[PDB]
Amino acid sequence: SLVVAVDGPAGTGKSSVSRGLARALGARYLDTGAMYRIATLAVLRAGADLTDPAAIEKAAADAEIGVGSDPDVDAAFLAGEDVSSEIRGDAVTGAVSAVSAVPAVRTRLVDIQRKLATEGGRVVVEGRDIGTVVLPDADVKIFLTASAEERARRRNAQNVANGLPDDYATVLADVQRRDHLDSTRPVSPLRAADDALVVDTSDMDQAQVIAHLLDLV
Numbered sequence: 001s002l003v004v005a006v007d008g009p010a011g012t013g014k015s016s017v018s019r020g021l022a023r024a025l026g027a028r029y030l031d032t033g034a035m036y037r038i039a040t041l042a043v044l045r046a047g048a049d050l051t052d053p054a055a056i057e058k059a060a061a062d063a064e065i066g067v068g069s070d071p072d073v074d075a076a077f078l079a080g081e082d083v084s085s086e087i088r089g090d091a092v093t094g095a096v097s098a099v100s101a102v103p104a105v106r107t108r109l110v111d112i113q114r115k116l117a118t119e120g121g122r123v124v125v126e127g128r129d130i131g132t133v134v135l136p137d138a139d140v141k142i143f144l145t146a147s148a149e150e151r152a153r154r155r156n157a158q159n160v161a162n163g164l165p166d167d168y169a170t171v172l173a174d175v176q177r178r179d180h181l182d183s184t185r186p187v188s189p190l191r192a193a194d195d196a197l198v199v200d201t202s203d204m205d206q207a208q209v210i211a212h213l214l215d216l217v
């Protein structure tokens, strides 16, 4: 019945680590970020006024959101359609902060996440405040951190690996800017639970992180 929480800022190796843990543990994998991104895609498709929280709420409420629970596959669904690729595109990336900010959007998705966490057997749940807000009684809580530079290196290498432009300076500026806005305009708690393992992954390979964590479970 193990519930595992994996939190931290983007580019720390968080998704690779969560899927790796889930793969190794024979657990379901719940990418909560993807769920916000799918909601965001529904909001964009609806034409909902992004300055109107009630319009955003309505469009996202109406969305039939599915995330694949299999760590070995990239699967995101909106009303049956495979949107895995699109939810990682520029439009969704740009809008997801606005959609995620709306309290009724979070309330809905948090409740779904809590229910999915008890569906049966093992589950690794990835996010920003899984350990502190969504699943405070999770059995294992992990918070991953790394320097801004290493987070940018990773995120830029991922862009390049996706045929996207190689622009480390721009990605670092973005990581820095989002760090700043997390500290002045956060939309949720963002720090490690007091009962979380805190891992600086700056000089470790994702496989080493997964392996060290497996040794502790």
Ligand SMILES: [Cl-]
Binding pocket: 010, 033
């Ligand atoms: Cl992200």
